[PDB]
Each structure stands twice: as structure tokens, then as C-alpha cells.
Amino acid sequence: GPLGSEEIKNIDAKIRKWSSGKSGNIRSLLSTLQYILWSGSGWKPVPLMDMIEGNAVRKSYQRALLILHPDKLQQKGASANQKYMAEKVFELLQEAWDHFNTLGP
């Protein structure tokens, strides 16, 4: 159910399994979003070879923002649990974006 404890803990666990060994790495997260997002989020898969140069990374990041940004989800009428899942994924994406723009991989 919306914000149900068992559902939320299950979402937590899926996000942990998905993000493991990817945290801080923007390409690792972007290249695998299709494995964590729900159906018809709008995400199109993007292989590592399409996110090599800086502007390609930035473009793919923009696309992820436009899906996962809490304001966009609210505006798209997402469910409470969708918003919860997105907030966790979006936190990971932001942390990785900041690393990309300074240290890289």
C-alpha cells in the first residue's frame, strides 16, 4: 500500500542491491537505470558507449533529472511509493553528478 512498511523496506532493499558498487559513479547508475525504474517511467536505456564524452554524460543526466526530479514526479502524478523510490535514486544520482563534475572515475 502507499508508504506501507513492508513495501517501503522492499524498495529500500532493491535500491541497495541495485546501487551496490555503483555509488558515486554517474555512468554506472545512468547505464543501469532500466533495472531500477518502473515501467513507462520514460527512461530509454543508454549503453556505456553512448555516455563517453562529457556532453553525452550531461545529456543522459538531464534525461534522468526530468524523470526523477521530485517536482517532475509530482507534476506527472506519481504514486507515494514511486516518489519514495525516486527520492532514493535521485539522491544517488546527485552525489554521482557532483563527483563526475570534479573527480570523474
Indicate if the alpha-carbon torsion angle 85, 91, 92, 97 is positive or negative: positive
Q: Which residue has cell 555503483?
A: 22
Asked whether 97 and 61 are in contact (CB, 8 A), the reply is yes
Residue 26: which of 92, 84, 85 has the closest Cα? 92
Report the number of distinct structural domains present in the chain.
Answer: 1
Method by which the model was determined: X-ray
CATH number, domain at 3?
A: 1.10.287.110
Host domain of residue 34:
1-105
In the three-class reduction of DSSP (H, G, I as helix; E, B as strand; rest coil), residue 91 is classed as helix
How far, in Å, CA of 10 to CA of 52, rounded?
33
Resolution (A): 1.8
3-state SS record for 10-33: HHHHHHHHHHCCCCCCHHHHHCCH
The neighbour count for residue 28, using CB atoms within 10 Å, is: 16
